[PDB]
C-alpha cells in the first residue's frame, strides 16, 4: 500500500482530534504513517501519551478506518456541560477550543455527579477509544472545575482496567499551563463493553475508530 500522510500534525494531535491538525488524506487503508511535525507535539495541552509507541504500531497496516461518534455530545452528558471545556492552549483560529475527538467535562452549576457511560461495540471491528485524565495544578482549580477534591476515574473493560486519580501539582510553565493532561487508549473487542466511571477529571471520548489491520 502507501503510507498515510498527515498535514501539520503528528499521530498525537491527529487522532486526538487536535484542532489545527486536520489531515486531508481521506485514505482508509494505509500501511504506516508519515507525520509533518511542529511545536505542539500533537498534545496542545501539556501531557504524556501513554503507550504511544503501542498506539503507533497499532495505527499501522490498516485496512479499514471508520470514525464514529461513540458518545454523542448532545445526548450523553446531561448532568455535566459539554461546552465550557475549552482553553487557549488548544485554539481554533485564535479562539479557545479543544480536541474535536474528546469532550472536557466540568461541573454543571455547582455539582459534578457520578457519571457512568458504557459502549458495547456493535461494530464488527476493533474500536480505538481515546480519553484523557486532567491533572489540575492547584487544589482550587479542582473544586472550581470539579467541586470534588476526592475524585477518581475508572475506565474498565474486559481487556483493560485502571483506576485514575488527580495528581495536583504546580508543573513548570508550558504553553501557559501549570497543569497536565495525560491521554490513554485501548482496543475494545467486537462484542465487549467498555465502561466509564468518574466523578471529575475525565476528558471523555466523543469519537472512536473502528478498524481492521493487515
Amino acid at each position, epitope marked *: 500500500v502507501a503510507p498515510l500522510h498527515l498535514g501539520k500534525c503528528n499521530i498525537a494531535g491527529w487522532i486526538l482530534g487536535n484542532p489545527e491538525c486536520e489531515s486531508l488524506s481521506t485514505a482508509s487503508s494505509w500501511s504506516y504513517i508519515v507525520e509533518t511535525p511542529s511545536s505542539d507535539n500533537g498534545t496542545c495541552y501539556p501531557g504524556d501519551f501513554i503507550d504511544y509507541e503501542e498506539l503507533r504500531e497499532q495505527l499501522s497496516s490498516v485496512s479499514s478506518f471508520e470514525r464514529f461518534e461513540i458518545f454523542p455530545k448532545t445526548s450523553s452528558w446531561p448532568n455535566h456541560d459539554s461546552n465550557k471545556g475549552v482553553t487557549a492552549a488548544c485554539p481554533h483560529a*485564535g479562539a*479557545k477550543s479543544f480536541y474535536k475527538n474528546l469532550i472536557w467535562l466540568v461541573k454543571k452549576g455547582n455539582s459534578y455527579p457520578k457519571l457512568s457511560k458504557s459502549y458495547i461495540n456493535d461494530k464488527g471491528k476493533e474500536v480505538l477509544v481515546l480519553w484523557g485524565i486532567h491533572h489540575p*495544578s492547584t487544589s482550587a482549580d479542582q473544586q472550581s472545575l470539579y467541586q470534588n477534591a476526592d475524585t477518581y476515574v475508572f475506565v474498565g473493560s474486559s481487556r483493560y482496567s485502571k483506576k485514575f486519580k488527580p495528581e495536583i501539582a504546580i508543573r513548570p510553565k508550558v504553553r501557559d499551563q501549570e497543569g497536565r493532561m495525560n491521554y490513554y487508549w485501548t482496543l475494545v473487542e467486537p462484542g465487549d463493553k467498555i465502561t466509564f466511571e468518574a466523578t471529575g477529571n475525565l476528558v471523555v471520548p466523543r469519537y472512536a475508530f473502528a478498524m481492521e489491520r493487515n
Partner: antibody
Amino acid sequence: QIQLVQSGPELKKPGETVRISCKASGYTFTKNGMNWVQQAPGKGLKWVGWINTYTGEPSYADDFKGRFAFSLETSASTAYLQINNLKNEDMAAYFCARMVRDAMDFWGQGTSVTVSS
Amino acid sequence: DIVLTQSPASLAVSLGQRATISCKASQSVDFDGYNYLNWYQQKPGQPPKLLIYAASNLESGIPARFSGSGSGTDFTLNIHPVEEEDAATYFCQQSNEDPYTFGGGTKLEIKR
C-alpha cells in the same frame, strides 16, 4: 504587514440592507477568526459576534441574532457583515478584528454607517 | 452576559506619574488558571489597539510602561510612567463566556 481594510462609509435609508467588507492581507485569512464590534461614540463598544474562518460556523451576541449575519469568501480572502433591516438604531461605526489569543489584535479600517432618508 | 465595569470614568494624571485603571467583572472570567482579560487603547478616530492579553502579557510592540495584573474578577491596568501620547480611551474586555463583553471604558487625561 497585516492589513484589515473595510469598505468606505455607507448611507442607506431605514429598512434597506448593507454588505460591509473586510479584506485580509499580510497573513493567512484561514487559521484565524474574524470578530466584529459596534462602536457608537460615548456609548462604548459592543461585541457583535465571531466567525470561525475555517469551520465557517458563526457565533453572535444575543442583541444581533436575527438581523445580523456573517458570510465568508475564502477563495478570495474577504469577510462580510450584513445588516437588515436597518432600524435607525445601529447608528455607529463597525470594526472587523482578528482572533489571535482570545483577544483582538489588528483591528480594521472602520465603516461608519448612517441610516437616514 | 458577564458585565464588566468602569473605575474611574476619567482621571487626570500628571506627566511622569502612575495612572491606575481597574475593572471588575460580575462573573469570574478565569478558567484552568488562565484569565481571559484583555485591555485596549482607542485614540479618537482610530480603531481600538490591543495592549495586554490574558491578563498580564504585553503585546509585542507595546511600550513596557503598560502593565496589567489581576485574577478572578478584579483586574488593573498600570501605566508607569505616563506620557502625552497616552491620551486616549481604555477598555477592558473578557473572553471567558459568550457573548464577549466590553467594559465601560476609561478616558485618560494629561495635565500640564
